[PDB]
Every structure is written in C-alpha cells, then in structure tokens.
Amino acid sequence: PEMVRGQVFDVGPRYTNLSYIGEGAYGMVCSAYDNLNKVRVAIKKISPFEHQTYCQRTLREIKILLRFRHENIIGINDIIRAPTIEQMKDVYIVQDLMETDLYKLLKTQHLSNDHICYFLYQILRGLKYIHSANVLHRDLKPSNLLLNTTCDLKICDFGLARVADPDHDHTGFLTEYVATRWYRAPEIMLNSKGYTKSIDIWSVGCILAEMLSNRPIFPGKHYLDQLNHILGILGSPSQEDLNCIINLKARNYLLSLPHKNKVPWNRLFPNADSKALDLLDKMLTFNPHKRIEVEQALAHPYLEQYYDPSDEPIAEAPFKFDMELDDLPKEKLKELIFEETARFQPGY
Ligand SMILES: Nc1ncnc2c1ncn2[C@@H]1O[C@H](COP(=O)(O)OP(=O)(O)OP(=O)(O)O)[C@@H](O)[C@H]1O
Ligand SMILES: [Mg+2]
Ligand SMILES: [Mg+2]
C-alpha cells in the first residue's frame, strides 16, 4: 500500500501517482491520478473514529455533501473505506482537484474588480443553495472557498454546519463558540448561538472586505477584541439595534463602551467600486434582522452582470431537522458513517 510523507495513504488501484497537498488535526490531503476517469483528483484521508467530536464532524460533512448537488459547492466523487465496520479505521474522500483556495490566492495575488465580482457572485450562488436547504454553513472563510484554474469557485468544509433553528438562537453574553473568529458575526459574541442564516451573510461580508484589500477586516486576537474591531469600524450601535438585544449583560456591555463613529468604507477601501461598497455595507450590518439576505445580495446592482435567478438553483430536498448528533456515542456515529458511505462500495 502506498505511503506519503510519514503515514499510509491507501487508495489503489484506482488512484495512483499521488502527491502531498496538506494536513489536518485528524487527516491529510493529497492529489492522485484517477485511472477510471483519466483526471487528477483530490483525496482527503480522514481518521476520526477515536473521537466523538471528529465522528460528528465527519458524519455531518459526508451527509451534507452527498445530498447537495450544486456547481459552487464541492461534491464527493467517491469514498474509499474497508468493506466492514471492524476493518474500517480511515475513510478517504475523493473530490475534484481544485488549483488553490481563496486564502492562499490572497496571500500573493491582488484581485481585479472583475474577479472580486465573479468570486462574490459564486459564493452567494452556492450560499443561496445551502440556505435553501435550511442549512447554515457557519464557517465561511477564504480557506473554505476552493478555486480551479478557470476561477470556478466551490464552497467546502461543512464540518460545523447545522440545520437553521431561529427559534432557539438566543443565548447569554460571551458564550463559547466553535467557528473561525475573524469571520464571526457580532451577535455570536453578544446573544446568538449562530443558528440563523444572517451569520453566514456576515462572514461573506468579511470575505468581500478581504478580497478588496487582501487583509482581514476584523482581525481580532480574541473573543471581545473581535467586537471592538467591529465597532471601531461600524460605529456604536443605534438605540434601535440595542433595543433588539434584550439580554442585559450584552446590552449593558455595549452601553459601557465609549461612543464611536462609523469609518466610511470608502476611507478604508479607496480603490473599491462604489457598488461593491454599498453591498459590503449591507452585509456588514450590525443588526442581524436588518442585514441583507442572500437572494437580495444576488440582486444587488454590483452583481448585475451575473444575476439570473433562473440559473441560481435551490435545493430539492431541504433538511427539516438537525442530525441528532450531540448526543450519539462514537460507536453509533462510526456505524452511521459506514452506512452513509455504502453506496460507493464495489457492486451495490
Ligand atoms: N478538492 C480539493 N482540491 C484541492 N485541494 C483541496 C481540496 N480540499 C481541500 N484542499 C486543500 O488541501 C489542504 C488541506 O485541506 P483542508 O483541511 O483545508 O480542507 P477542508 O475541506 O477545508 O477541511 P478542514 O475542515 O480540515 O479544513 C489545504 O491546502 C486545502 O486548501
Ligand atoms: Mg477548512
Ligand atoms: Mg452555467
């Protein structure tokens, strides 16, 4: 069985002449040649079975990617694992090979206004499909946007995704959270569990800001510093926005801060297109109820060259309830993984 820089990477016979691409907390990524389809592919080795949290993440991502089918969301082409639950220790997920991700591209390339427009259009086209299936991604960020050599963009990484549950979104002040700090909406820090669609629109607004300047807009170093960063640019929230925060601890914290005025986006991004800044402002709205939703953003004048709602499809089959994964022991989650991957086994 083939090896790759340290650990075994066992995907023959079909996938051959492999090459290292990257690591994880509990897997690794290589490219490989696909002998049936005669193309190179990406293969992610996942070893999650020792750890309940990992099993959850892996199950969630497999179940979601297998039921989604959209041009701007990464598909699973194949899944390689042992034929029995006893012998299954690792799972390999085969996907289209993407040239790069938006994080890597932005460390070295300036994007033209045309590219920023086209990438934003594709991110919102894919997000329309995701929200239409009642799913929230929760971890949108440049490293989770894959790009190929012709600038097709696919959203990936649904490890933290959840079914939307707006009725149960409210929580206390400074409650712990999982997703990537620089792209987290202000309400996550204040009074939200991140169970509504508006948290993904905030992360897209942070990604747009980062495409315009090649630097994260709110690069907080930690938890309430992230909010300081936000308020330093957006200004103090209005009375109407604070009246929407009933939790006294979060309300009082905001009232304790010195007043700050808005820094105009054109002061921050003097080369940006004025239409892009108008859309940025609407995605980076403090009040999640006033923040633009995905279909409104697709309709914004900035995207008028690409906008066509008949070519912006929605899901056939929404998730009604969350995967009951809290919750399940490792052993049950391994069995659901084995079951969800069965369709890829020889014969069948
Ligand atoms: N389909 C793919 N094609 C090419 N590279 C990929 C693909 N999926 C991931 N990668 C890359 O392989 C390396 C490690 O993968 P990465 O862990 O970032 O993927 P992910 O879906 O974001 O999962 P994770 O939850 O581990 O971040 C990174 O450099 C990443 O950009
Ligand atoms: Mg990722
Ligand atoms: Mg088309």
Under CATH, which architecture does the 98-326 domain have? Orthogonal Bundle (1.10)
Residues 6+ apart with CB under 8 A from 201: 127, 283, 291, 292, 293, 294, 297
Where exactly does CATH 1.10.510.10 map onto the chain? 98-326
Pocket test for ligand 1, best of 19, 21, 74 (most atoms within 8 A of CB): 21
Say how far residue 97 (Cα) sits from the centre of its chain.
18
Where exactly does CATH 3.30.200.20 map onto the chain? 1-97+327-348
Ligand 1 atom with the smallest distance to the CA of 95 is: 1
∠ CA 243-246-248 to the nearest 5 degrees?
110
Under CATH, which architecture does the 1-97+327-348 domain have? 2-Layer Sandwich (3.30)
- Does the beta carbon of 42 lie inside 6 Å of ligand 1? yes
What positions carry a catalytic annotation? 139
Buried residues in 321-335 as b, exposed as e (16+ CB within 10 A): ebbebeebebeebbe
Q: Which two tokens stand for residue 105?
A: 């591209």
Answer whether 207's CB lies under 8 Å from 134's CB: no
